[PDB]
Amino acid sequence: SVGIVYGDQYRQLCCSSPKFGDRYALVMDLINAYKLIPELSRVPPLQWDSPSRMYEAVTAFHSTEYVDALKKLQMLHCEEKELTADDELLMDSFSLNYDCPGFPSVFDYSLAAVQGSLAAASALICRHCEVVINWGGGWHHAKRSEASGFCYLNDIVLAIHRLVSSQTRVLYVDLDLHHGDGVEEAFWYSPRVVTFSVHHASPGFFPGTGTWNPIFLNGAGRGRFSAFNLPLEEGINDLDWSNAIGPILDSLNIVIQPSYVVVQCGADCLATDPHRIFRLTNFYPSLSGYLYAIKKILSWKVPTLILGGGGYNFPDTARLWTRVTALTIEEVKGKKMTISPEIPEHSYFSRYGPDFELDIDYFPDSIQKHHRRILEQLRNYADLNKLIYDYDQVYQLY
Template identity: 40%
Template sequence: PVYVYSPEYVALCDSLCKVPKRASMVHSLIEAYSLLDQMKIVKPKVASMEEMASFHTDAYLQHLQKVSEEGDDDHPESMEYGLGYDCPATEGIFEYAAAVGGATITAAQCLLDGKCKVAINWPGGWHHAKKDEASGFCYLNDAVLGILRLRQKFDRVLYIDLDLHHGDGVEDAFSFTSKVMTVSLHKFSPGFFPGKLNLGGTGDVTDVGLGKGRYYSVNVPIQDGIQDERYYQICETVLKEVYTVFNPDAVVLQLGADTIAGDPMCSFNMTPEGVGKCLKYVLQWQLATLVLGGGGYNLANTARCWTYLTGVILGRTLSSEIPDHE
């Protein structure tokens, strides 16, 4: 597998105020379990304006660049671009966004070039951003950029989102096409993000895509408290059907760790092993697979989860005795 990493990249990702230092916690735990030896480490390129504009509008990107240079969180136009409360316009946010977008594109390119079957970018997976709007801690939709890059070679791309939250930004981006199928398992209850109290939730089971893309969006709303066994049953049932019907050429997996018991979101009751079973199910298809992170606000648990999942990708079972590391 390819593991996208550079010290500069991790340092930039560490600066994200919603998950401070998470990227380096994840990386150092993966390193402590000596998993890096079994992966090809690829240094990420930074996304160009042109690459980001394959999805995002020029106006949004220029605004993001402007407020990022000035560290201006009170710009009058920022509200309409979704910047502020959940997505503060902090200084350097544009560099961070371009780095994450570039890392996911780099991972996708490795799959295009046949360098590997699986490419990993744990600091990626920011699935809420819209073409002209930041949302839910997401400034740039790297998952969409990765899918668009994969589409240069792979005709049908399947996006699977196992984060606690509905992958609305990715679904919206591809809601009119039959070439990208989006599948999201998520908590669904009135007012739970990205739903709004007055408008109900998003990602209801009736939300199936539009136009040519009708029935190419699959949503699996789930109630609080779900545990590994039931979650895996649902996941396997859905993915079995999806695989048969859609017959994908490549897969993008978003594995947000905010479903794990002990997350401040206090919603699902999963363990890394439960998510690992879902990951194994996808890996047995042996397709080009791009693996991304996402949510995960209990930072130590998130590091444990993604390290465990890295082990799953490598076919290694990790001991729960965490090795000494920084």
């Protein structure tokens, strides 16, 4: 079956941040308005038997002092008076500031995404679901002891950690506009989690990594060659983006043969995202790069975790993720999902004005070098990890 993470409290928590507002509610209500929920198995967010069990789950990746600091930040923001200078300095030392501010629910909000993605991972492990979707998750920037890019807790690293420790290999695929640095870094020394991020990179653009460093770094120790990156120039469309990553996806699957796939599907590559950097769509006839990638990944028939991420045009993120959700049901259950080109009436209908259609409102050799580089890296990866692959069969894809 296809699972999806939601619950009433979950919804409230995912909608309590100053940066992403009610986006999750738009997403889940658009999915509901298109009658997709009856097709889906609800996956309840994980809860724990005690504070100690919660901490040992979260400190599987994050340091105890960082988790303490985040929890204290929440408490401090549930009080009237300003932070002391000592508290400011403490928060600064974990980058809990600037673009990662405190707010009254910052800990519960962050933890919620972890609860969802851990429950999603468990539903895959026990084989209750073939695919699980968590649109409240996908926070790929958070580090062991540092908030970054409005990511406070890295639900992806924790979910992946549960998957590998269940021999097991995980392929992580990061489609967000931004480099998934936090996930990449977490598994930098681990060959069993192969990470692949496609993203914009350019001087001064956040977070700075996932590109020429001059050479391409790609893992260390036994994890050498296990971190893959494809940095792309601004302005790329659905077709060029698809052609850029399609051969890479297929070759990674063939060579790695992952036991699980985890996909971060941040929607900030949409042409209508305020970043205005890539020109991807949610079109399903030209064809959305997102839907192309997901369809390709689901065709592998590997247990899969699909996560959200970036996406700052909320109704258009809803439009895309509603389509990813329908496509997942169709590919997994083999049952056609017809989605009306018009937005159905529902609680958030007015947010989709003024045209109220499902399509986003938009009218549409460097890469060849990157493919050779990535092919060579995949070869070094296989060599280092003694994996058997048809070098030709892989080379033909490109």
